[PDB]
Amino acid sequence: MTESLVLSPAPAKPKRVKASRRSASHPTYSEMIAAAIRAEKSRGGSSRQSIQKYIKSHYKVGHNADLQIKLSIRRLLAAGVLKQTKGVGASGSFRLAKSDKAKRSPGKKKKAVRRSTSPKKAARPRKARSPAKKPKATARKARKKSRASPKKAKKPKTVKAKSRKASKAKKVKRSKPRAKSGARKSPKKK
Amino acid sequence: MTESLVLSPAPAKPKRVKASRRSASHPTYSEMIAAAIRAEKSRGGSSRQSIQKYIKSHYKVGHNADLQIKLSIRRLLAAGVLKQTKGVGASGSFRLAKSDKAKRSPGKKKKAVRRSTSPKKAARPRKARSP
Amino acid sequence: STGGKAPRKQLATKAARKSAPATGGVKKPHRYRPGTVALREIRRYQKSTELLIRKLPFQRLVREIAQDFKTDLRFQSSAVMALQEASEAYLVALFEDTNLCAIHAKRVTIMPKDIQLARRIRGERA
Amino acid sequence: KPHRYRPGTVALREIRRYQKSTELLIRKLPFQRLVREIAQDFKTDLRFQSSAVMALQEASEAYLVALFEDTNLCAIHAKRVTIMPKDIQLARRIRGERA
């Protein structure tokens, strides 16, 4: 812990702390890596260049951040807050431990049928003139539970019945007729 | 049964703000205690009362959830994604998969600071005499 | 039935709580717990009247020790069986004391810490 | 202020004195009266010899100290320094003195 490493090069590091103002959302030094982690939007995670780009909006170009990132990753590993994926498909992709619980691997079918219906919902009205409406094709029950038509139909009735506000119920015949009006514009008839 | 019959109230109780594109509650038992552990100011994690305060909101499943909380904590232990800290007066130290217990020298652990009474304690003397 | 392609959140209506180890939701907590099934055996074994270790391997065990002591030895069926019953009750009697030693240390299962204490008090060891 | 000793330590130096001993630690006269009294409960008007009374004491002293060492091994199993009624009853049961 020699002087040429504790006082000679130090002044740069304490001088630049907790000042990532340009990214207003969570500018804390410890939270930049984590903010990149939620912003990545991928199962594998963020690799080195991905995390560097996601952190880089301003205030960060890397005079010493290239090695400071490795040092912070070592600190986060000592804290046990990092979960990652190996392989050459993802060149050291990293994630923060966001309770995305690890479990046994086997049981990976080569399709995702439940989300396979979403692209068709995106495509069909968008291919039509009437743009993609609000997520009304399937309700919140779609990821509440996973059941067939009778159980996915009885529950919306309870959803609407438990909300007994007449004023709230008035909106279902004032926000929906907009679709009826737009059905005149997008197709020429019916 | 434990996921299709017993949790019949599960579609019913968190029915409203367990799914919302603006902001939604944490699904099932996967990650309820996650944000509770992270956004935390206590030096010794949660104590089975801060857990209730953190999870408790406008709506919750809340049906025999004391059983499921303990069961989930123990199963997450057995898998290896929960790690705790020893103590007596801390009323338990529930933390996440953060591996902060493996290698660390014993020197006591006391972090506690928050400026909530301090503004009021500063406003009290001026209020007693001349605002 | 929230799914999510994750066990303990998966479907257990395809599986069963009634002894279907196929991966799914969490099973029923009792699950014929080891305490319950063990109580079945202790009730049955403390009521029945039978030998509870294999006969010929025990006879082979005595033959192995006998060969070292005497090059050629002749045995009787009654003598081997007589040795077995005393030997069977020897560990039965020890386990009664071994179980009592476990309760003393606020414990329920017998461990090698118990056997060293029980035998020394009896005078078998040291 | 007295020099004092930490509790439980004086037992260690007492052990090195009492293990290295060739005497009886129970006063002979109370033991002699005790033996005569309990004997009267089964047979009245009995005479005793000094050697015979000492013989009962010597057997009793060895019986108790042997039990204490056996009881001591029960104390460590309980993860405590102090031996207690729970220790003695367990030791007696294994030793066959509880029947």
Add this chain to the structure above:
Amino acid sequence: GVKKPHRYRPGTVALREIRRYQKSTELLIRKLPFQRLVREIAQDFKTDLRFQSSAVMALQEASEAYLVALFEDTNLCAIHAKRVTIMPKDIQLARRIRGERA
């Protein structure tokens, strides 16, 4: 408050140790601890055996050189496995090809 030492990185002093030990002509095992070992090994099969200091030195030198040559032989197995560690996997393999196990 002692000044923090200039700690060498792990394995750095191994080069310095090699310089001394390659030039070393001493015996790494002490005399009396090895004397008790050889006496018991002989006693295990035949009792009432005497010993000489010169004979003890002969037993030590042959055993040490046997192990010393093994380590260099074992090292050639490590590089073949793309590593520098010495493991029982390396040790068992090193003996087997040369013999001493059959």
